[PDB]
Design a protein around this nucleic acid. Structure first.
Ligand SMILES: [K+]
Ligand SMILES: [K+]
Ligand SMILES: [K+]
Ligand SMILES: [K+]
Ligand SMILES: [K+]
Ligand SMILES: [K+]
Ligand SMILES: [K+]
Ligand SMILES: [Mg+2]
Ligand SMILES: [Mg+2]
Ligand SMILES: [Mg+2]
Ligand SMILES: [Mg+2]
Ligand SMILES: [Mg+2]
Ligand SMILES: [Mg+2]
Ligand SMILES: [Mg+2]
Ligand SMILES: [Mg+2]
Ligand SMILES: [Mg+2]
Ligand SMILES: [Mg+2]
Ligand SMILES: [Mg+2]
Ligand SMILES: [Mg+2]
Lengths: 79, 126, 312, 113, 98
RNA sequence: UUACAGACUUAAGCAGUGGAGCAUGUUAUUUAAUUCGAUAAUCCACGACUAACCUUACCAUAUUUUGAAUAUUAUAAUAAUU
RNA sequence: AAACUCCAUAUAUAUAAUUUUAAUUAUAUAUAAUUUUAUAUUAUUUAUUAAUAUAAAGAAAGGAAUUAAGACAAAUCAUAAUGAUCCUUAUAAUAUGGGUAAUAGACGUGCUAUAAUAAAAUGAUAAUAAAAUUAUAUAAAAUAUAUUUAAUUAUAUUUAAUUAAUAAUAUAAAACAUUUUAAUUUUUAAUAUAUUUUUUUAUUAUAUAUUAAUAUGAAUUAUAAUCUGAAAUUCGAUUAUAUGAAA
């Protein structure tokens, strides 16, 4: 849990183009912190193999992009 | 210890002729370093070999001597030093309270340069 | 007595190939790494060629790096068999053979001596002292390297019956027990010569109050009468006679095979019959025993030559 | 002609493998940029400065290549390249330490009692 | 403890001034620690040894008179020729131009 | 095949293992990958005296092609020699 | 091979101007035991003997290393190294992210716990250690916040001393004393009572449920903050409030 006094984990992203054009933002920066500006924008977040499409709501601010792109498949046994 | 003691004896002889009162060699506590290894290269972590290293120490003190004579002692014993012996010398100089003519970091400089660059000045604008 | 005399015991400092102590531990690690790298480099400078069919291989031991406060001395033993001009003439007095050319670049060459190059690598004065050994069985390291690298045609199809025989007639079979007892008698004689000298110098009187504090017995000459450099030094020197030697082979010379040659004694009786005490080098190797291993590559692959010598 | 790393670096003098080359490159670039990283970290963590300058420094820090990261330096055995159980007193793995120690290569190391 | 805090703060400030120390009465995080940490770059970058060591390739120009033989290199070249004779050589490497 | 002797082998005592939660290793299964061993005694906090990145050996995507070496032959830039 | 050794132990000498202080120490050298002697008893190969006890002398009671042979063609080609064979625009090289942390069952090894011969608090002229570490550092005291008079614990601020027999990590802990402790009506409280007074006795009230989980236990989980790092999402550590499972 990053100390609040340090601020958000800001990463270089193309937000201006996604706000003037509406294009999805494809990124591997799973550590990035969802800033309040991101709300409404569409992100394609790498999960190690594919890019998961996700639109950001107001209940996602503060969390990190990686939290919404699961990297493992649910476990199953050959019962 | 063998070269250490032999060399210490030589220093006392050098000092005597130079007129330097010397005391010692006082033996200081020997330091022991230890390392434990597993003898096998890959597995078998149940058989472990022990290794150690001992640092032997000696203290020779000089008294009531002028700085110039003390430097001659250090120069001579340096010229004729033995293999595997190290030497640290603490010099003590008594001085007057007030003397005549007396007896900026890299990071700070770069910070000033960075805070003047456009990538930072573009924000500091008030 | 044995450990209090420079001629009767091996200084423990000699058990290590890098003889150094630096307060700055990082500089000590760096010096140690530099000694291994230079040792490898020197091994690559020992093979010389005059013509395609004249390749002279000098067998070099591991280096002894003596780090003092002011200089570094690199001491190593080398063996060279002069096969190009092994005559009874003095033609060698008018040219420098390849081995002399190699040894003269260590210190003598005024422009590109290896010492000056190394002096910048180490940031201290450096000297190199090559010491020539005339036999290959006087140093365990040289002996192993020779077999491994030069005697391959003798043990690559099994150990030749002549090769083994030569490795068993190298030294006459000295009687260790009498040599050990001769050494102990000489020590007793020297010890009894000094006690008699003092007893006589005291009984002859050479302040009664001062005759209870001082221990000065008298003139140095009388105390050491008949104890000179011509009779004391060579009689007390240790590890002077090879009394045992074991040469082992192993590897593929389609399965690995090991052959062991054992000849002589691998113990010292000077320690049993006398108060003299043995010392273990690196705390696990007896002082008398010197063991070294050298490996090489053949058509099948890696094979190791393990030689052990017992000098008493 | 085609060096594998963005900047030209000298090779280590001893044993070499790809992993040693990668670790050594990171060590050299950490030294060249150590001051830069400390200066940016200072600006980003100095609460007396405005938040905008602090966030600018944090962004610049996140954009630095991985070969400038101190935390990516890993101590490896200078003789074998193995990166597990490496003794820092000799920069050797346990096995190479034992072999060197018994050969008398380590300045003052003897077998324990 | 009975000494008024104002008096103890005046002593701290003056003392810090004389000894060229940073006086931060509020306690705001200033980053001064970062500015004081030591630079470990030189030690870290020397881990693998001094790169400017004499190498075997430099011996043919330092000592032109002497002809040294690299047995390790020589062994490698013989193994390459042997594999060429058995037909087990290496495939020709593709050219980027292609 | 005989007879010996040895240990081999139980007992006693202290605290434990085997039950709960958690930590950790392994197996199995899953997975784009869950790197690879070791894996009765003699594997299973073992290799590993520290897997967020690095480490890393695995997977996805993108990218490099004489690559880290030695030598040969050209081309240049540079300093000496002549 | 054993011994001869080395360590430990006891002692002696040397060294320290006894403020680098631990002289009750440090570490060089040397000595000592593989103990010795007397007597009685029981056995004997009965003698110049063993087993025993008794007396006397002694600090003397413990350890390590110490090599030869063979086997399991036992582990390792993943510490590094070699042959053969295979890849060579890829089975080599670099970057970003992911994985090695998945979860039905099973196994090994640990940790914590299931309360009264045992857990919790508190103990400042500071009960009592050893062995280590500090130039790719160890961090004192103080101040501020959590947070309350203060202490304690955690972090921040600041960075004293020491690169060390000197200063720091670091006032060891258990022990011991006092207090407290569910199950337990074995308690607590209100009156009265005492020559048990930190306590006794009497009369009332103090629960019900209950083979059971408490003021035992601390898994799981919510929220906030902090530490390292460029970065803590998969996947780190710490703290506070709340949660309080199995046993
Ligand atoms: K991470
Ligand atoms: K004292
Ligand atoms: K990972
Ligand atoms: K309890
Ligand atoms: K303590
Ligand atoms: K409960
Ligand atoms: K995390
Ligand atoms: Mg690391
Ligand atoms: Mg269990
Ligand atoms: Mg990676
Ligand atoms: Mg990884
Ligand atoms: Mg296997
Ligand atoms: Mg794992
Ligand atoms: Mg105390
Ligand atoms: Mg404090
Ligand atoms: Mg206390
Ligand atoms: Mg307590
Ligand atoms: Mg509780
Ligand atoms: Mg229950």
């Amino acid at each position: 849990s990053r100390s609040v006094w340090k601020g958000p984990n800001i990463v270089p992203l193309p937000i201006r183009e996604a706000m003037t054009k509406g294009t999805p933002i494809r990124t591997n920066a799973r550590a990035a912190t969802i800033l309040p500006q991101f709300v409404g924008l569409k992100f394609q977040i790498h999960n190690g193999k594919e890019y998961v499409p996700i639109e950001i709501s107001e209940d996602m601010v503060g969390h990190k992009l990686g939290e919404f792109a699961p990297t493992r498949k649910r476990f199953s046994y050959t019962q | 210890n063998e070269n250490l003691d032999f060399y210490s004896d030589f220093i006392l002889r050098t000092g005597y002729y130079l007129g330097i009162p010397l005391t010692g060699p006082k033996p200081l506590p020997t330091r022991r370093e230890r390392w434990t290894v597993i003898k096998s290269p890959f597995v078998h972590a149940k058989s472990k070999e022990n290794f150690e290293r001992h640092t032997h120490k000696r203290l020779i003190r000089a008294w009531d001597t002028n700085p110039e004579v003390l430097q001659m002692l250090i120069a001579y014993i340096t010229k004729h030093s033995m293999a595997g012996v190290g030497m640290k010398c603490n010099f003590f100089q008594r001085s007057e309270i007030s003397l005549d003519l007396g007896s900026t970091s890299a990071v700070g400089q770069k910070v000033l340069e960075l805070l003047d660059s456009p990538d930072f000045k573009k924000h500091l604008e008030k | 007595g044995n450990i209090n005399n420079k001629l009767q015991h091996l200084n423990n400092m000699n058990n290590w190939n890098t003889q150094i102590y630096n307060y700055n531990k990082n500089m000590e690690i760096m010096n140690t790494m530099n000694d291994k790298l230079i040792n490898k480099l020197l091994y690559k400078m020992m093979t010389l060629k005059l013509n395609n069919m004249n390749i002279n291989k000098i067998i070099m031991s591991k280096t002894i790096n003596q780090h003092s406060l002011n200089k570094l001395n690199i001491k190593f033993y080398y063996y060279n068999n002069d096969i190009n001009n092994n005559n009874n003439n003095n033609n060698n007095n008018y040219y420098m053979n390849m081995m002399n050319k190699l040894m003269n670049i260590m210190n003598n060459n005024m422009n590109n001596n290896l010492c000056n190059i190394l002096s910048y690598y180490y940031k201290k004065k450096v000297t190199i002292e090559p010491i020539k050994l005339s036999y290959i069985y006087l140093n365990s390291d040289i002996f192993s390297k020779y077999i491994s690298l030069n005697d391959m045609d003798k043990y690559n199809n099994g150990i030749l019956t002549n090769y083994q025989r030569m490795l068993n007639n190298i030294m006459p079979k000295l009687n260790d027990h009498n040599i050990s007892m001769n050494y102990i008698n000489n020590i007793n004689n020297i010890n009894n010569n000094k006690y008699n000298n003092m007893i006589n110098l005291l009984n002859n009187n050479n302040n009664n109050y001062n005759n209870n504090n001082n221990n000065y017995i008298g003139n140095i000459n009388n105390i050491y009468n008949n104890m000179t450099i011509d009779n004391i030094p060579m009689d007390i020197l240790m590890y002077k006679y090879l009394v045992g030697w074991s040469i082992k082979f192993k590897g593929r010379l389609g399965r690995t095979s090991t052959t062991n040659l054992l000849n002589g004694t691998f113990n010292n009786k000077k320690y049993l019959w006398s108060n003299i005490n043995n010392n273990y080098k690196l705390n696990y190797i007896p002082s008398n025993h010197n063991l070294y291993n050298n490996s090489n590559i053949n058509k099948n692959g890696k094979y190791n030559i393990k030689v052990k010598l017992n000098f008493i | 002609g085609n060096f594998r790393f963005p900047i030209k670096t000298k090779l280590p003098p001893g044993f070499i493998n790809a992993r040693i080359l990668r670790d050594n490159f990171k060590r050299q670039q950490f030294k060249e940029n150590e001051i830069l990283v400390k200066s940016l970290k200072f600006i980003a963590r100095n609460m007396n400065l405005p938040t905008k300058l602090r966030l600018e420094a944090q962004l610049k820090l996140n954009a630095l290549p991985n070969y400038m990261r101190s935390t990516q330096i890993k101590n490896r055995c200078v003789d074998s390249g193995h990166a597990r159980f490496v003794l820092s007193d000799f920069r050797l793995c346990r096995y190479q330490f034992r072999e060197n120690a018994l050969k008398g290569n380590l300045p003052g190391v003897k077998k324990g009692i | 403890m009975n000494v008024p805090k104002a008096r103890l703060l005046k002593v701290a400030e003056l003392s810090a001034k004389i000894f060229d120390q940073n006086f931060n009465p509020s306690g705001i995080r200033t980053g001064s620690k970062i500015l004081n940490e030591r630079l470990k770059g030189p030690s870290v970058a020397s881990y693998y040894g001094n790169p400017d060591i004499l190498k075997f390739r430099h011996l043919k120009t330092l000592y032109p008179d002497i002809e040294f033989v690299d047995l390790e290199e020589q062994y490698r070249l013989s193994m390459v020729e042997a594999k060429k004779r058995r037909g087990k050589g290496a495939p020709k490497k593709m050219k980027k131009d292609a």
